[PDB]
Amino acid sequence: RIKKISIEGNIAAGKSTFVNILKQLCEDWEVVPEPVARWCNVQSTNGGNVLQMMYEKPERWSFTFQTYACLSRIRAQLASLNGKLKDAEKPVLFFERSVYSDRYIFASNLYESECMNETEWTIYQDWHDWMNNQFGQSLELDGIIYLQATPETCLHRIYLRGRNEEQGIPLEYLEKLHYKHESWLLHRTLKTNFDYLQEVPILTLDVNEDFKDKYESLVEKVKEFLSTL
Amino acid sequence: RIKKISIEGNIAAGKSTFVNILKQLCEDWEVVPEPVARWCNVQSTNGGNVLQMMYEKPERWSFTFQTYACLSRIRAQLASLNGKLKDAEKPVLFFERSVYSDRYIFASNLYESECMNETEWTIYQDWHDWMNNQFGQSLELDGIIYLQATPETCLHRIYLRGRNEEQGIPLEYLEKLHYKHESWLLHRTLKTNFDYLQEVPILTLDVNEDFKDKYESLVEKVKEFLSTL
Numbered sequence: 058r059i060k061k062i063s064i065e066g067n068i069a070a071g072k073s074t075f076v077n078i079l080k081q082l083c084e085d086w087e088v089v090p091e092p093v094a095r096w097c098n099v100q101s102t103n104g105g106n107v108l109q110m111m112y113e114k115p116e117r118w119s120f121t122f123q124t125y126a127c128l129s130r131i132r133a134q135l136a137s138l139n140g141k142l143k144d145a146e147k148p149v150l151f152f153e154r155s156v157y158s159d160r161y162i163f164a165s166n167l168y169e170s171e172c173m174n175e176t177e178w179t180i181y182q183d184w185h186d187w188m189n190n191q192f193g194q195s196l197e198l199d200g201i202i203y204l205q206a207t208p209e210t211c212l213h214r215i216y217l218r219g220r221n222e223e224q225g226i227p228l229e230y231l232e233k234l235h236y237k238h239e240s241w242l243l244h245r246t247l248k249t250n251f252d253y254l255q256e257v258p259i260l261t262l263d264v265n266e267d268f269k270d271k272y273e274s275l276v277e278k279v280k281e282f283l284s285t286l
Numbered sequence: 287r288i289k290k291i292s293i294e295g296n297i298a299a300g301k302s303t304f305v306n307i308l309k310q311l312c313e314d315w316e317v318v319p320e321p322v323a324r325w326c327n328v329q330s331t332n333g334g335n336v337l338q339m340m341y342e343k344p345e346r347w348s349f350t351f352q353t354y355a356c357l358s359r360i361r362a363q364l365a366s367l368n369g370k371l372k373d374a375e376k377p378v379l380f381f382e383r384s385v386y387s388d389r390y391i392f393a394s395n396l397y398e399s400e401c402m403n404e405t406e407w408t409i410y411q412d413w414h415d416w417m418n419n420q421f422g423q424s425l426e427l428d429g430i431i432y433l434q435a436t437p438e439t440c441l442h443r444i445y446l447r448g449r450n451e452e453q454g455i456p457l458e459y460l461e462k463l464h465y466k467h468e469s470w471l472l473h474r475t476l477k478t479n480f481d482y483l484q485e486v487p488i489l490t491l492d493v494n495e496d497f498k499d500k501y502e503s504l505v506e507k508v509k510e511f512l513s514t515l
């Protein structure tokens with residue numbers, strides 16, 4: 058009953074920045090941010106920083122991170138499907154990344170990088186499938202917004218943001234993630250267990266340019282794209 | 287609507303053996319075996335053997351094993367709550383170990399053995415809680431059957447069974463698990479997030495003696511205990 062749109066994009070491409078100009082465009086919109094800070098100080102519903110543990114020894118912590126990161130995002134997105142939004146008129150729910158990015162972009166890539174052995178990779182997909190199998194049907198996307206920026210623009214915006222764990226991120230890693238986004242959201246040549254995705258609508262925004270300027274345009278293309286849903 | 291009883295006990299104490307004499311005692315009984323073989327050849331719903339990986343390098347694979355082992359047992363127990371049992375008269379569902387053993391016995395112990403750091407331990411409990419939070423209410427136990435045997439009897443029965451991964455298991459490990467079972471099912475001095483357990487009925491069977499003989503007794507005490515539920 059609520060339109061759910063996922064915001065996809067490379068590390069530091071500008072998702073959180075795009076998310077902050079969303080609510081002010083319509084009282085009917087909701088945003089579920091990526092629980093990034095919660096991965097940095099692992100506490101039960103100051104402690105460990107699994108995001109950094111993974112970035113510092115991926116073949117040791119990729120599975121754990123992928124396991125916790127995804128469950129985490131699902132809970133956040135599910136919680137928001139029980140808020141004031143239910144009482145809204147034209148409720149549109151935004152997701153900062155999706156269970157798909159987690160699996161077909163990051164997890165997929167860490168595994169192709171030998172950072173997860175067959176065993177870890179098999180267990181992860183089995184979990185991931187079963188997750189959707191359960192609390193999945195209520196999270197399907199009506200549309201996707203691909204925030205597109207060159208991995209070179211990404212590597213620089215990372216530097217601007219200043220998050221410590223990400224400061225050691227190499228261009229090469231950003232490139233691999235880039236092509237996977239391109240393969241999934243641009244060329245649309247990515248295979249997944251969730252058939253509906255293949256048909257799901259996609260809005261591609263070139264955010265390589267200054268947000269200061271391209272802002273007015275984007276708002277237009279967003280309202281636009283949203284009406285066609 | 288179905289009485290669900292959990293069978294608890296140390297490694298090789300005699301659970302599977304006890305499980306095999308159960309169905310023949312009443313057509314109304316069902317048994318959900320511990321997915322042990324499925325942990326030995328990790329395949330999606332010949333591959334990896336996470337059970338052995340964990341026994342050979344616990345500080346590397348305890349979390350993974352605990353994560354997969356528990357989800358696995360829940361699915362198995364949940365599936366059986368949708369079988370021919372629903373059509374039964376006096377349906378009694380048996381569980382070979384429970385999500386509690388997984389957490390308050392094995393996981394708890396691996397963590398006290400520095401085999402899981404705070405981060406892993408925090409993530410595991412957060413997952414474990416949230417799991418029950420979901421598909422939990424329908425798995426509550428009406429009663430527990432503690433199959434009690436000395437860790438020394440256990441170490442020998444392990445040798446009899448012949449499972450390879452377990453052949454390297456030291457008495458010391460069996461002792462630690464022993465006292466945790468004693469603490470939970472005997473002295474009943476174990477603290478858990480699931481309050482009902484504290485009141486749940488318990489049947490303690492001393493299975494240190496030959497199964498060939500103590501069999502007739504056990505059957506009596508089982509039917510007995512079951513009637514009082």
Ligand SMILES: Nc1ncnc2c1ncn2[C@@H]1O[C@H](COP(=O)(O)OP(=O)(O)O)[C@@H](O)[C@H]1O
Pocket residue numbers: 066067068069070071072073074075214215217218264265266267268269
């Ligand atoms: N379109 C843009 N133009 C200029 N700077 C941008 C743009 N988008 C993001 N930034 C900068 O990048 C940083 C934020 O990146 P961020 O939004 O956190 O990436 P993500 O949303 O994927 O985490 C900010 O410090 C901001 O100054």
Ligand SMILES: Nc1ncnc2c1ncn2[C@@H]1O[C@H](COP(=O)(O)OP(=O)(O)O)[C@@H](O)[C@H]1O
Pocket residue numbers: 295296297298299300301302303304443444446447493494495496497498
């Ligand atoms: N009460 C018993 N008396 C004699 N032998 C037993 C008894 N219980 C189990 N065994 C032996 O131990 C082995 C099975 O242990 P098992 O049932 O697999 O432990 P668990 O059920 O915890 O996995 C068998 O090979 C069987 O011969």
Ligand SMILES: Nc1nc(Cl)nc2c1ncn2[C@@H]1O[C@H](CO)[C@@H](O)[C@@H]1F
Pocket residue numbers: 067068069091093111122123126158159160163164167223
């Ligand atoms: N699924 C994810 N896997 C990995 Cl290895 N990293 C992820 C995942 N989802 C988000 N992130 C990380 O979250 C941080 C903020 O987006 C970035 O370091 C990176 F994008």
Ligand SMILES: Nc1nc(Cl)nc2c1ncn2[C@@H]1O[C@H](CO)[C@@H](O)[C@@H]1F
Pocket residue numbers: 296297298320322340351352355387388389392393396452
């Ligand atoms: N939760 C469990 N954790 C660990 Cl480390 N091992 C477990 C767990 N549950 C069952 N097992 C194992 O399953 C095998 C058969 O019961 C034994 O090696 C041992 F009991």
Ligand SMILES: [Mg+2]
Pocket residue numbers: 072073091093153
């Ligand atoms: Mg972000």
Ligand SMILES: [Mg+2]
Pocket residue numbers: 301302320322382
């Ligand atoms: Mg067994």
